Structure formats: structure tokens, C-alpha cells
Amino acid sequence: AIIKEFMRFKVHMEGSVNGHEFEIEGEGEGRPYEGTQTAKLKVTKGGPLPFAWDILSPQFSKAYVKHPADIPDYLKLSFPEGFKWERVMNFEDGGVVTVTQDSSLQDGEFIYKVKLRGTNFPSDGPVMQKKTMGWEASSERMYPEDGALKGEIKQRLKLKDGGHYDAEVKTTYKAKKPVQLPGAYNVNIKLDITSHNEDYTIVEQYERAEGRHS
Amino acid sequence: AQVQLVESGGGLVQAGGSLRLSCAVSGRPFSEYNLGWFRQAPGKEREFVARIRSSGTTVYTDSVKGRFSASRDNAKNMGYLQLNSLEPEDTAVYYCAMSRVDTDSPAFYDYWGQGTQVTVSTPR
């Protein structure tokens, strides 16, 4: 057995945002064929963080996307070896987040390792001032290119004052060994922060994700 | 609530491995029904795999004989399909269905599950 209908994961992230270094450790679980999962994350170094948790939340699992039977589930098929991904988020005010990630399978659990660098967030912007309140539901346009699977998202953060704050996100996903790529399709995603302590050093998340034909 | 058949037990496994599919039935006196299993791979038509009659006798399509085994537990309102010695060609969505008609034809089945994905890979 490689992927069961219920799977746990462990995640470690090391990051820096506007020069502030930190580490996070977490554990999650979900139902990969149903497209649902949760995670509990803890800031283990560099806490409390001086910036919005919301820029980190999408970095903590695309093996848990429900796919129609006729769309190859490339990231599931990459196991047991797994896959890597690289992401750039370009925020409307010039902040940039670059992310690299490795996903593997060890003793029946997924293992995630994340490296993140954020730069150029304005000091009075909503990220450094912690003025965000969660992502709106996203649709990621997926397409094969250069032997990899790529995704593009127009992502939108809610602001506490009622406004919104946008980012353009591009990700490249690459299986460690060659497996069958899909055609172009969409992945619908909704990510929720379901609980947090006062300074966001312990945070719980829930995500639902489902692939659909364009 | 409405009659429901719910498959579980699928996933991704390497060739030669095994999975145990199950079908949980609600809303009917399960012991009266025959339970059929069908599968559909991408680009192909859905095909009969196996069935267990209300009487307990079983029928298998030729390509799965000696590898797959259908059983039932009436007290649990459950049917089972044990998949042993899996091959890449067994990759498909597997469906359970029930009827009081004894047949391999999907046309006479009254209720269908939503399906469970079974993917059999080759090692590399």
C-alpha cells in the first residue's frame, strides 16, 4: 500500500520574512481521495512572528486533491518517491514570497520540508501590520509544461478593514520519477484558519481541494 | 434517508499487492439483495468483475479468477471484494451495485455506489 484513504503528514518549515528568521513544525491528516485535510502548526523558533500568518498558510499538500477519474492525479502517482514544488507569490504592493518544498513518504506518512523567503513587504502594509483575515476561495489553473505540472492562481486575501489584497501565484510541481501528466484543468481550493492562540504561535488549518475540468 | 451504497478501501498500491474493498449498504434489507462489482478504467467501458448472490454463491469474470474474492456479512450490511495479486491492468474506479435480479448486466441493478479508485503502479 502506498496511499490509503486516510493519511497523516509531518511538516517542517524554515523561513525568513523581511529578514525575520523562524522555524515551524507541524502535523496533519486527511483523506486524499476526498480532498480534505487539517494541520496543526507550531512556531518553534523566532516566535512570535512579526507578520501575518496568512502568507504562510498555503505552504503547509496537493496529494490531498480530489480528482475526477479521467484526470491523472500526477502528484499522487509520484509516490512512493514523491515530488518537489517551487512557488513564487507576487503581492500587489511589491512583497514577494519564494518557496521550495520536498514531499516524500516514510513509514506510511507524508513528510514535507519547506523553505520560504519573503522580501519587500512595506512596513505599513497589511502583512507586516497583521491586518489580514484569511484567503478567499481560489481556483488554480493547472497545465503541463516542460515535463512538469504548473499552476497559476489569482489569489485574494481579506483585510480586517473590509478591503482585499491580491497576489499572483505561480507554482511548478515535479515528480521525482517520471509519471503521467494530466491535461489542463482547474483545482478549486478553500483554506481556513480554524483556531489559533493569541500570538499565532499555535495555529490549526483546514483545506478542501477538488479538481474539475475547465 | 435514501438508499445508499458507499464503497471504501481503495488507494494506490504497487503491482503484486492487495486491497480490500467494501460496500456499506443502508436503507434496504441487505440479505435479500445480490451484490455486484463493476470497474471502469479511463477511456474504456465499465465491465463486470464479480458478484455474490443473496444465496452466497459467487461469479467472477475470467480475468480475475483466483485473484479477487467476493464475500458478504449480512449482520454488518456489508459486501467485500478482496483484491489480491493486483496488476497495472486492474487500475480503475470500482463500483458496487445491488439488485434482486441475478445477472452480470449492469442494466438490472437498482443502486450504485459512488466508486472507489484503485491504482496499481509498477515499481521503479
Numbering used by the authors:
A (entry chain A): 6 to 65, 138 to 291
B (entry chain B): 2 to 125
Give the exact sentences the study uses for this entry.
The identified nanobodies for GFP have demonstrated diverse effects on its fluorescence, such as GFP enhancers and minimizers, which increase or decrease GFP fluorescence intensity. The crystal structures reveal that LaM1, LaM3, and LaM8 bind to different regions on the stave side of the mCherry β-barrel, with LaM1 and LaM3 binding in relative proximity with some steric hindrance.
LaM8′s binding affinity to mCherry is mainly contributed by CDR1, CDR3, and one residue in the constant region. At the same time, CDR2 has a minimal direct contribution to the interface. Furthermore, salt bridges are formed between Glu144 of mCherry and Arg29 of LaM8, Arg164 of mCherry, and Glu33 of LaM8, respectively. Gln3 of LaM8 also binds to mCherry at Lys168 through a hydrogen bond. Additionally, the residue recognized by LaM8 and R169 in mCherry is replaced by A164 in DsRed. Specifically, LaM8 could bind to the complex of mCherry-LaM1 and the complex of mCherry-LaM3, as shown in Figure 4H,I. Interestingly, the binding of LaM1 even increased the binding affinity of LaM8 to mCherry (from KD 199 nM to 54 nM), while the binding of LaM3 only showed a slight effect (from KD 199 nM to 236 nM).
